Design an enzyme around this catalytic site. Structure first.
Site, mmCIF file in Angstrom:
data_model
loop_
_atom_site.group_PDB
_atom_site.id
_atom_site.type_symbol
_atom_site.label_atom_id
_atom_site.label_comp_id
_atom_site.label_asym_id
_atom_site.label_seq_id
_atom_site.Cartn_x
_atom_site.Cartn_y
_atom_site.Cartn_z
ATOM 1 N N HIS A 32 0.933 -1.143 0.000
ATOM 2 C CA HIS A 32 0.000 0.000 0.000
ATOM 3 C C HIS A 32 0.970 1.189 0.000
ATOM 4 C CE1 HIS A 32 -3.170 2.790 1.534
ATOM 5 N NE2 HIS A 32 -4.076 1.834 1.374
ATOM 6 N N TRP A 36 2.603 5.041 4.735
ATOM 7 C CA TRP A 36 1.581 4.647 5.689
ATOM 8 C C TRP A 36 1.759 3.237 6.222
ATOM 9 C CZ3 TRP A 36 -1.834 6.355 1.143
ATOM 10 C CH2 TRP A 36 -2.082 7.727 1.190
ATOM 11 N N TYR A 37 2.085 2.293 5.326
ATOM 12 C CA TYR A 37 2.172 0.884 5.692
ATOM 13 C C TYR A 37 3.479 0.228 5.277
ATOM 14 C CZ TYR A 37 -2.735 1.666 6.515
ATOM 15 O OH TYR A 37 -3.935 2.158 6.987
ATOM 16 N N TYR A 63 4.091 6.463 -3.034
ATOM 17 C CA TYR A 63 3.295 7.656 -3.330
ATOM 18 C C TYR A 63 4.227 8.872 -3.413
ATOM 19 C CZ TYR A 63 -1.524 6.005 -2.291
ATOM 20 O OH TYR A 63 -2.739 5.357 -2.287
ATOM 21 N N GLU A 136 -0.945 6.259 -11.872
ATOM 22 C CA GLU A 136 -2.267 6.524 -12.389
ATOM 23 C C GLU A 136 -2.556 7.960 -12.788
ATOM 24 O OE1 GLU A 136 -5.332 5.002 -9.708
ATOM 25 O OE2 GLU A 136 -5.137 2.990 -10.571
ATOM 26 N N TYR A 199 -10.761 -2.982 -10.873
ATOM 27 C CA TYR A 199 -11.305 -3.348 -9.574
ATOM 28 C C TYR A 199 -12.505 -4.248 -9.843
ATOM 29 C CZ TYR A 199 -7.792 -1.215 -6.963
ATOM 30 O OH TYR A 199 -6.559 -0.943 -6.410
ATOM 31 N N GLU A 225 -1.783 -2.929 -10.986
ATOM 32 C CA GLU A 225 -2.626 -2.718 -9.805
ATOM 33 C C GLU A 225 -4.018 -3.284 -10.105
ATOM 34 O OE1 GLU A 225 -5.354 0.223 -9.226
ATOM 35 O OE2 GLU A 225 -4.461 1.068 -7.348
ATOM 36 N N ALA A 231 -13.562 0.317 -6.813
ATOM 37 C CA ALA A 231 -12.504 1.205 -7.246
ATOM 38 C C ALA A 231 -11.865 2.064 -6.169
ATOM 39 C CB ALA A 231 -13.013 2.134 -8.355
ATOM 40 N N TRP A 259 -3.507 -5.270 -5.285
ATOM 41 C CA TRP A 259 -3.545 -4.196 -4.300
ATOM 42 C C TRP A 259 -4.460 -4.595 -3.151
ATOM 43 C CZ3 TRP A 259 -1.097 0.433 -4.246
ATOM 44 C CH2 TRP A 259 -1.536 1.363 -3.292
ATOM 45 N N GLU A 266 -10.042 -2.071 5.016
ATOM 46 C CA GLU A 266 -10.683 -1.802 3.733
ATOM 47 C C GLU A 266 -10.692 -3.139 2.987
ATOM 48 O OE1 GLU A 266 -8.487 1.324 1.807
ATOM 49 O OE2 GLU A 266 -6.860 -0.009 1.188
HETATM 50 C C1 LIG Z 1 -5.252 2.320 -7.318
HETATM 51 O O1 LIG Z 1 -6.476 2.071 -6.671
HETATM 52 C C2 LIG Z 1 -6.417 1.919 -5.253
HETATM 53 C C3 LIG Z 1 -7.851 1.780 -4.741
HETATM 54 O O2 LIG Z 1 -8.536 2.982 -4.999
HETATM 55 C C4 LIG Z 1 -5.701 3.102 -4.638
HETATM 56 O O3 LIG Z 1 -5.464 2.763 -3.273
HETATM 57 C C5 LIG Z 1 -6.302 3.473 -2.367
HETATM 58 O O4 LIG Z 1 -5.767 4.793 -2.342
HETATM 59 C C6 LIG Z 1 -6.459 5.655 -1.442
HETATM 60 C C7 LIG Z 1 -5.958 7.083 -1.625
HETATM 61 O O5 LIG Z 1 -4.558 7.118 -1.359
HETATM 62 C C8 LIG Z 1 -6.267 5.091 -0.031
HETATM 63 O O6 LIG Z 1 -6.916 5.920 0.909
HETATM 64 C C9 LIG Z 1 -6.075 6.690 1.745
HETATM 65 O O7 LIG Z 1 -5.549 5.836 2.739
HETATM 66 C C10 LIG Z 1 -4.649 6.477 3.623
HETATM 67 C C11 LIG Z 1 -3.979 5.413 4.487
HETATM 68 O O8 LIG Z 1 -4.955 4.804 5.321
HETATM 69 C C12 LIG Z 1 -5.427 7.542 4.430
HETATM 70 O O9 LIG Z 1 -4.503 8.289 5.209
HETATM 71 C C13 LIG Z 1 -6.054 8.530 3.423
HETATM 72 O O10 LIG Z 1 -6.978 9.395 4.073
HETATM 73 C C14 LIG Z 1 -6.927 7.739 2.428
HETATM 74 O O11 LIG Z 1 -7.415 8.570 1.396
HETATM 75 C C15 LIG Z 1 -6.879 3.684 0.035
HETATM 76 O O12 LIG Z 1 -6.684 3.109 1.326
HETATM 77 C C16 LIG Z 1 -6.131 2.818 -1.001
HETATM 78 O O13 LIG Z 1 -6.701 1.521 -1.115
HETATM 79 C C17 LIG Z 1 -4.286 3.191 -5.269
HETATM 80 O O14 LIG Z 1 -3.625 4.333 -4.758
HETATM 81 C C18 LIG Z 1 -4.446 3.453 -6.755
HETATM 82 F F1 LIG Z 1 -3.213 3.406 -7.401
#
Ligand SMILES: *[C@H]1O[C@H](CO)[C@@H](O[C@@H]2O[C@H](CO)[C@@H](O[C@@H]3O[C@H](CO)[C@@H](O)[C@H](O)[C@H]3O)[C@H](O)[C@H]2O)[C@H](O)[C@H]1F
Length: 300
Positions: A32, A36-37, A63, A136, A199, A225, A231, A259, A266
């Site tokens: 991820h 964060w992780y 990121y 993306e 997705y 991914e 999504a 992913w 989640e």
């Molecule tokens: C491809 O798609 C996936 C699924 O949409 C994207 O992964 C998601 O990205 C989100 C936005 O970064 C992420 O949410 C964030 O998570 C963070 C960690 O917990 C929070 O701090 C933040 O508020 C929140 O928006 C989803 O957890 C993650 O699955 C991927 O980035 C795309 F490439």
């Protein structure tokens, strides 16, 4: 082991092949966000994925925005840790410049060039490395011809100065779904692949036909991914549609990275909350998504 057996990867007639020219298919996990992780990305967890799940590729999702590399460049060292672990475990590794909210790859293009120069200088003489220069691209104003292709035509030369032919994955429009447009206006580099992301929560019959269209133009596609969820990365686990996509990818010999490897609450997360960050997961430490993905890779 995987990299010793297959060695140098390249693109031949739109297909991913090994150093003996045989088709190969990579299946693995994406981290991820590393900001964060990052605790789940280490030699031991990667070794457990290799040995227990059967992965042959690991994707390090660095990121750029959202607290990532632009905000704190310390995350580049975690990418290095992942690459070195992949080298030690003899598996492939994707270095992902994970744009998302910074929806046009040109926003941080100078930083991307410097980052990819450093990464290719350090690891360009290993066959394990695969570069993913723009996760993306997204937004109606971010097109293949005007924004994405020109970005790739500035970043690829930087990598190619250090690493002449390891694979480079280039994101496509509309969150890496618009492979049709990229396939009709391909890049010149012979070892480029175009990203396609999906997705399972989305009904995917037309998206599968669109991937087939791109493949028919001789464009190589890497599913860098994909998730079993909606999504957003959450919203339920959709295993019937996920299995249709798995079968489609095997029929087309498409490589992929699921992913994602995290315990976040989640649907797309592969692990449950007290999953050990260094691996050795029991059945109870895998989520419904992770259980399914593990089965798919072990079956292969
Ligand atoms: C491809 O798609 C996936 C699924 O949409 C994207 O992964 C998601 O990205 C989100 C936005 O970064 C992420 O949410 C964030 O998570 C963070 C960690 O917990 C929070 O701090 C933040 O508020 C929140 O928006 C989803 O957890 C993650 O699955 C991927 O980035 C795309 F490439």
């Amino acid at each position: 082991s995987v990299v010793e057996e297959h060695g140098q990867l390249s693109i031949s007639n739109g297909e991913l092949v090994n150093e003996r020219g045989e088709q190969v298919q990579l299946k693995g996990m994406s981290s991820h966000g590393l900001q964060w992780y990052g605790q789940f990305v280490n030699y031991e967890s990667m070794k457990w994925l290799r040995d227990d799940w059967g992965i042959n590729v690991f994707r390090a999702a660095m990121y750029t925005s959202s607290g990532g590399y632009i905000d704190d460049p310390s995350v580049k060292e975690k990418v290095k840790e992942a690459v070195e672990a992949a080298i030690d475990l003899d598996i492939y590794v994707i270095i992902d410049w994970h744009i998302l909210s910074d929806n046009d790859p040109n926003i941080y293009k100078e930083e991307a060039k410097d980052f990819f120069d450093e990464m290719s200088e350090l690891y360009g003489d290993y066959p394990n490395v695969i570069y993913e220069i723009a996760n993306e691209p997204n937004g109606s104003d971010v097109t293949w011809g005007n924004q994405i292709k020109p970005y790739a035509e500035e970043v690829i030369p930087i990598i190619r100065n250090n690493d002449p032919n390891n694979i480079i994955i280039v994101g496509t429009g509309t969150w890496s779904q618009d492979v049709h447009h990229a396939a009709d206006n391909q890049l010149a580099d012979p070892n480029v692949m175009y990203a396609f992301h999906f997705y399972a929560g989305t009904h995917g019959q037309n998206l599968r036909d669109q991937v087939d269209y791109a493949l028919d133009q001789g464009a190589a596609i890497f599913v860098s991914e994909w998730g079993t969820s909606a999504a957003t990365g959450d919203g339920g686990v959709f295993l019937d549609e996920a299995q249709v996509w798995i079968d489609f990818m095997d029929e087309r010999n498409l490589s992929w990275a699921n992913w994602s490897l995290t315990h976040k609450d989640e649907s797309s997360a592969a692990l449950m909350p007290g999953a050990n960050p260094t691996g050795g997961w029991t059945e109870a430490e895998l989520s419904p998504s992770g259980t399914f993905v593990r089965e798919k890779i072990r079956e292969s």
